C-alpha cells in the first residue's frame, strides 16, 4: 500500500537508550560521558593510544 516514513519517532529524551557509542553502537552497554562515549570494553582496548596510564 502507501504510508509515511519511519526511522523511529517516539520519545528518547534521556536515559541510557538516549546514548550510543562511537565504536560498538549500543544503548544499554556502557557510555563513558567525558566527551569519550564508548563502552567499558572498548575503553580498555583504546586507552594506550589515548595516553592513559595503567599505573595506579
Amino acid at each position: 500500500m502507501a504510508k509515511a516514513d519511519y526511522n523511529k519517532r517516539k520519545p528518547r529524551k534521556f536515559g541510557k537508550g538516549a546514548r550510543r557509542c562511537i565504536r560498538c553502537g549500543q544503548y544499554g552497554p556502557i557510555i563513558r560521558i567525558q566527551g569519550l562515549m564508548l563502552c567499558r570494553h572498548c575503553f580498555r582496548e583504546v586507552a594506550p593510544k589515548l595516553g592513559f596510564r595503567k599505573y595506579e
Binding site: Q34, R40, R44, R53
Partner: protein, 102 residues
C-alpha cells in the same frame, strides 16, 4: 606595553617543562620584563574502571591517571614581542593560552 599571561598546560611532564624553560630563556633578553614560570596544580583525573567484561568472579579493576599540568607566565612586552616568543616548535600536545590586558 601590555601585561600578557601565557597559561600553558600539557598532558605529559617532559613536554611541558621544555617549553616553560625555553619560554623563560628567549624572552629574558630583548624588551621584556618576565615574572618566573610558576607551576599550578595537576588536576589529576581519575577514571576508575571495571576490567572484566563478564563482571564475574573477582574482577581486577583498572586505576587510570590523566594528569594535566599547568605552568603560568606573566610577561611585560608588546603584541609583536609576544609572537617572536611564540615562534617555538611546541610538543603536540601543549595548550598555550594568551590573555591580553594593559
Amino acid at each position: 606595553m601590555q601585561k600578557a599571561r601565557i597559561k600553558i598546560a600539557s598532558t605529559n611532564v617532559r613536554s611541558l617543562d621544555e617549553v616553560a624553560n625555553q619560554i623563560k630563556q628567549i624572552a629574558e633578553r630583548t624588551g621584556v620584563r618576565m615574572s618566573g614560570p610558576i607551576p599550578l596544580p595537576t588536576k589529576r583525573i581519575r577514571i576508575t574502571t571495571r576490567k572484566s567484561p563478564d563482571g564475574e568472579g573477582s574482577a581486577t579493576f583498572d586505576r587510570w591517571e590523566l594528569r594535566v599540568h599547568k605552568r603560568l607566565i606573566d610577561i611585560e612586552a608588546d603584541e609583536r614581542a609576544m609572537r617572536q616568543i611564540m615562534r617555538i616548535r611546541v610538543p603536540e600536545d601543549v595548550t598555550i593560552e594568551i590573555e591580553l590586558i594593559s
